[PDB]
Amino acid sequence: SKAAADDFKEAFLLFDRTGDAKITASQVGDIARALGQNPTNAEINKILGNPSKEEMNAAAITFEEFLPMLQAAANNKDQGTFEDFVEGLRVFDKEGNGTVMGAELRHVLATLGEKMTEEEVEELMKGQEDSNGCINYEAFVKHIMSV
């Protein structure tokens, strides 16, 4: 709205590697996340196809399409409730203390639903899981929602 945030246009100049002021359709998922929006990858996929937009063939962009797609994704930020994120992992391990065994969270984050690479899974556990093999998800989900 501007509140006209012109820093979204300045961040589009940091993600366009050619400097022509266009951003390919394959970068739009990760740049919506870097502007403070977490649409799921199936949602980013649907919307695209919904608009008869094929992410399979070469794509370019213009700021005039990327701005309204970020504004259509911005209504879905009401789905980011931290009660359900901590209660999900609280149902994932027994006893009254928030600890996932290391390999349980790593294999679930790579193979269940939207596949996260094991390189990204190791980069998200690095520091929050110590050598006991127990990830405290009270501080883990706190630090994941700090970015």
Place this chain on the structure above:
Amino acid sequence: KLLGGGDVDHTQYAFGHTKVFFKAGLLGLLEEMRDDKLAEIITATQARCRGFLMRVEYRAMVERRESIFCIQYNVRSFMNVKHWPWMKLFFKIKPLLK
């Protein structure tokens, strides 16, 4: 051990000596609804992660910024120099020094 993972109803099944037992078709129905409900819950929780994941990549890319250059230029020198009389000289000579 496998069933350890998944955002699945750990109820709906039951194990025994030769096999597991599984519901469908109601409990089957339940789960399904549930399934969608995690994509939500999940799909949204994935994103941030994804987001966040790359957000750390930028902090690294950036750090790296110069250490590369340093490495970059630094090599180039050598490729040029190593063939220079004066530099070979310095080289054989560099040792006699203290």
Place this chain on the structure above:
Amino acid sequence: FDETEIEDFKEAFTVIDQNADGIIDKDDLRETFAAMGRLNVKNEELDAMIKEASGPINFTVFLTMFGEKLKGADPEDVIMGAFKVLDPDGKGSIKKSFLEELLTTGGGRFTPEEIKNMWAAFPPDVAGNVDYKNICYVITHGEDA
């Protein structure tokens, strides 16, 4: 330029300036080469070294000429710093294909053709990216050790 590297160039300037007056002339170049074993050093080689300067080779003219040729010169401790960050678990020499991919995909200075020239006198291990350390030696002091 760190100060010990500038003191190394001051010691090399004193070993080539055998008249000890502070200016390396063509006679100093020829008598330093003859004391290293070069009995056949041509006058055209001495004239090509003097043709790289606009004036007499005093200590600051020798430092500015070496500065302008070594604008990416890196000491061995900072090259081993960067190679310890590339091998952050320590000890192991890093893979050949990992250094080829990371040189190219990060920077234009790491483009391939240049990577074939890196493997070409920096031998296999060095080229490959497995050993480590011998390349830091030959980047600070050239030729085979």
Place this chain on the structure above:
Amino acid sequence: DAEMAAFGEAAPYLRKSEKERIEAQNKPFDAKSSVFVVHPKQSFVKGTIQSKEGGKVTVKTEGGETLTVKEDQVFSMNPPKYDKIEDMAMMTHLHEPAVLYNLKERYAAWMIYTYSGLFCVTVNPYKWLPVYNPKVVLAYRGKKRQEAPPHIFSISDNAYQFMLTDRENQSILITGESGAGKTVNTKRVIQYFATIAA
């Protein structure tokens, strides 16, 4: 394969080669179309669903026949993963046909012992088999029924086991029609006891 040695010679009548299996479980399957169906002459034969009359069904046959039968004259067919299942009760398709069919298939392959829950189904070979083989007897000795293929000595040994393990008495109930050949089993069970604990 590796396991089977004890039997070795009997093996083929107890279990199938590890690829015979593999070649059977890992094969093409079309669930939505493949089915079992009612049949006026033969009880239940298999077929492929052709069309759908809204509550009638037309199916091709395995022999080549086309019948339009009710919706509930039609029964699903287990994925190939359940070919000659040791325990039909592990099937995900608890029908009438699937049971008939499982027994039948592992018989045409000369396997007379197939379990159906707790039961130990036994089919009259009508010929001779290395099953009562003096090697087998040992083989089945000290083995839970999950450590070995469907067989009577399984039942018979487990009883024994269980007997000493739980400190409870046991029983074996053999039953079938006049020609099913129970005496034979009964006797055979008996020898078993006598041997393994005399």
